[PDB]
């Protein structure tokens, strides 16, 4: 939190022949799960709950 580069350049270039296309439409989706084998491999945790 002192001297990182948090700046992000634009992904695609925008042009006069390009700007108004209404591209695709993003699929929120679900995060990619790990392989069964890896899943058992690693140790999981059950968060202590309350309020």
């Amino acid at each position: 939190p002192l001297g990182s580069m948090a700046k992000r350049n634009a992904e695609k270039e925008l042009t006069d022949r390009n700007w108004d296309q209404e591209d695709e439409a993003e699929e929120v989706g679900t995060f990619s799960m790990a392989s069964e084998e890896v899943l058992k491999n690693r140790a999981i945790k059950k968060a202590k709950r309350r309020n």
Binding site: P1, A6, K7, R8, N9, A10, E13, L14, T15, D16, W19, D20, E22, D23, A25, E26, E27, V28, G29, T30, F31, S32, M33, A34, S35, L39, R42, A43, I44, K45, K46, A47, K48, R49, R50, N51
Partner: protein, 426 residues
């Protein structure tokens, strides 16, 4: 569709049959649906001839039609563009920029515009032929909308290209003219001026300073309030681009009161504008504490949160960045504030997303916050983190648990750490 008569006249030595023929050509080549370009190009010497007609200093109408012809040939196909370049048109089109017949000038600038905008290769070639000085020289005098419209459009095409971009040193000399064009009333000249500025401002910090040094920021920011989406779009991007520079560069944009304009654009109907506005804001909330504060003060975060609940996903991605950026550069008091507006919830709902990236963004935001609540714990209480409860009730704790199944190892570990850290697991 092409007769021998038209060919005989073209090659004869009377400037009358030559012109009459040339006209038949262009009129045919002006057929939208399929111009007989193949035949024209097929008959040998025809293109080379049209090129030689451009040299007729004494003949305005003949030069005008020949350039019109070569244009219909070149424009609309990379290969035939190559053929015309190969006959030597470009150096001559450039020559015609400085002729007494303005119509020839307009036509030449157009032609050159079309050629340079065909590809990276052609752009860099037309520049190597010094189109710039005479082209820029056109602006010097009071020229009709049409002459200006084509001129600035040419420049746009000469600045366009991200891979590879043109040698900056070759397109920068047009910066002054650009900033001047930002005060024209016409929305076409305005739009294309922004586009060129949009292009130049895209890249490293040294290039950004060049744009800034031309004195465009004020007018650029002023243009975000424009009514037409075709001039707001490129202006926004140029602005947005500039705030990818260092804190000092992006302060220049801030000092133009861009923030209230941006706030306005977050309500814009056009999703494209929203997204682009968040992206911009994101790059500002990625600056120093004071700049973050300016964003808060602009009363922007209320809108960013509602955007995280209403707007489209690809837009939300940007807004999520804005928040997390604030959370990592912001003060205890600043974070407390974002949380007060209920930013924990929107972040939580992004934990289980497809984009492995936005997940990390959401984890980073929630961590920073927890890091605060970890502070507030010891310094008062009954020291229990106030925030991991708010996270638990936003179903974030459930999602963080799940994330311990993510494909990405680093993400698995983060979720594992956050739990063992701020919550615990028997």
């Amino acid at each position: 569709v092409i007769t021998s008569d038209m060919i005989e006249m073209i090659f004869s030595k009377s400037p009358e049959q030559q012109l009459s023929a040339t006209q038949k050509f262009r009129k045919l080549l002006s057929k939208e649906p399929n111009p007989p370009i193949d035949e024209v190009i097929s008959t040998p010497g025809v293109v080379a001839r049209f090129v030689e007609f451009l040299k007729r200093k004494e003949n305005c109408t003949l030069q005008f039609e020949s350039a019109w012809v070569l244009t219909n040939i070149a424009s609309g196909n990379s290969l035939q563009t190559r053929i015309v370049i190969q006959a030597g048109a470009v150096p001559i089109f450039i020559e015609l920029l400085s002729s007494e017949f303005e119509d020839v000038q307009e036509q030449a600038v157009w032609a050159l515009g079309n050629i340079a905008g065909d590809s990276t290769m052609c752009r860099d070639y037309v520049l190597d032929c010094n189109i710039l000085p005479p082209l820029l020289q056109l602006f010097s005098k009071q020229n009709r909308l049409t002459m200006t419209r084509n001129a600035v459009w040419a420049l746009s095409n000469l600045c366009r290209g991200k891979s590879p971009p043109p040698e900056f040193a070759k397109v920068s000399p047009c910066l002054n003219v650009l900033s001047w064009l930002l005060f024209v009333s016409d929305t076409d000249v305005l739009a294309d001026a922004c586009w060129a500025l949009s292009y130049l401002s895209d890249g490293p910090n040294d290039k950004i300073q060049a744009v800034i040094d031309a004195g465009v920021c004020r007018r650029l920011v002023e243009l975000l309030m424009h009514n037409d989406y075709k001039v707001v779009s490129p202006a926004l991007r140029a602005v947005g681009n500039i705030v990818t520079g260092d804190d000092i560069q992006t302060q220049v944009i801030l000092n133009c009161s861009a923030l209230q304009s941006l706030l306005h654009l977050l309500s814009s109907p056009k999703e494209s504008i929203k997204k682009e506005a968040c992206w911009t804001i994101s790059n500002i909330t990625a600056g120093n504490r004071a700049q973050i504060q300016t964003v808060i003060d602009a009363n922007i975060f209320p809108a960013l949160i509602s955007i995280l609940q209403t707007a489209e996903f690809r837009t939300r991605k940007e807004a999520a960045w804005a928040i997390t950026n604030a959370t990592s550069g912001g003060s205890a008091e600043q974070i407390k504030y974002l949380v007060e507006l209920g930013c924990i919830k929107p972040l939580c709902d992004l934990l289980t997303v497809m984009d492995s990236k936005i997940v990390q963004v959401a984890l980073n935001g929630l961590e920073n916050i927890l890091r605060l609540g970890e502070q507030e714990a010891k310094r008062n209480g009954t020291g229990i983190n106030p925030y991991c409860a708010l996270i638990e009730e936003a179903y974030g704790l459930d999602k963080i648990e799940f994330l311990q199944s993510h494909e990405n190892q680093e993400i698995y570990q983060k979720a594992f750490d956050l739990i063992e850290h701020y919550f615990g697991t028997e």
